[PDB]
Amino acid sequence: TNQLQYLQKVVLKDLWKHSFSWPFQRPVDAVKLQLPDYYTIIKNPMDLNTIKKRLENKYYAKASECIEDFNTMFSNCYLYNKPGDDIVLMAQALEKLFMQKLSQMPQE
Numbered sequence: 001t002n003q004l005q006y007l008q009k010v011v012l013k014d015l016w017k018h019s020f021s022w023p024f025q026r027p028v029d030a031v032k033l034q035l036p037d038y039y040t041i042i043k044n045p046m047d048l049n050t051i052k053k054r055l056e057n058k059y060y061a062k063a064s065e066c067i068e069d070f071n072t073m074f075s076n077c078y079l080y081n082k083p084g085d086d087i088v089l090m091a092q093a094l095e096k097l098f099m100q101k102l103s104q105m106p107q108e
């Protein structure tokens with residue numbers, strides 16, 4: 001659980017504390033945001049709270065399964081949203097930090 005512990009205690013913590021993480025802290029609320037196509041276009045949604053619960057509940061078999069979920073979260077944001085949107089600028093800044101935290105992760 002070495003790399004899964006670093007994903008929880010360093011990567012997830014430092015993304016959560018970033019000022020732009022708030023849109024990713026819960027699943028997209030399609031009702032309150034009136035985005036009725038979101039869950040049709042995004043078949044495999046993901047968000048930081050789902051990742052937080054999976055790490056707390058030891059749902060992941062391996063670190064790479066948790067990395068796939070962060071990557072899906074970012075990919076979904078770029079797929080659904082438009083290049084000039086606030087949320088895309090926010091995702092890009094959070095993903096840059098993500099890639100730095102992975103570069104500093106110790107080996108298993």
Ligand SMILES: Cc1cc(-c2nc3cnc(C4CCOCC4)cc3n2[C@@H](C)c2ccccc2)nn(C)c1=O
Nearest residue numbers: 022023024028029033035076077080081086087090
């Ligand atoms: C991953 C993701 C997340 C959000 C999303 N969560 C929000 C939660 N709350 C508010 C607001 C609701 C009203 O109170 C203020 C926050 C806005 C929210 N958005 C959008 C509309 C948004 C974010 C940042 C900037 C601008 C728009 N929207 N899509 C399309 C995504 O792909």
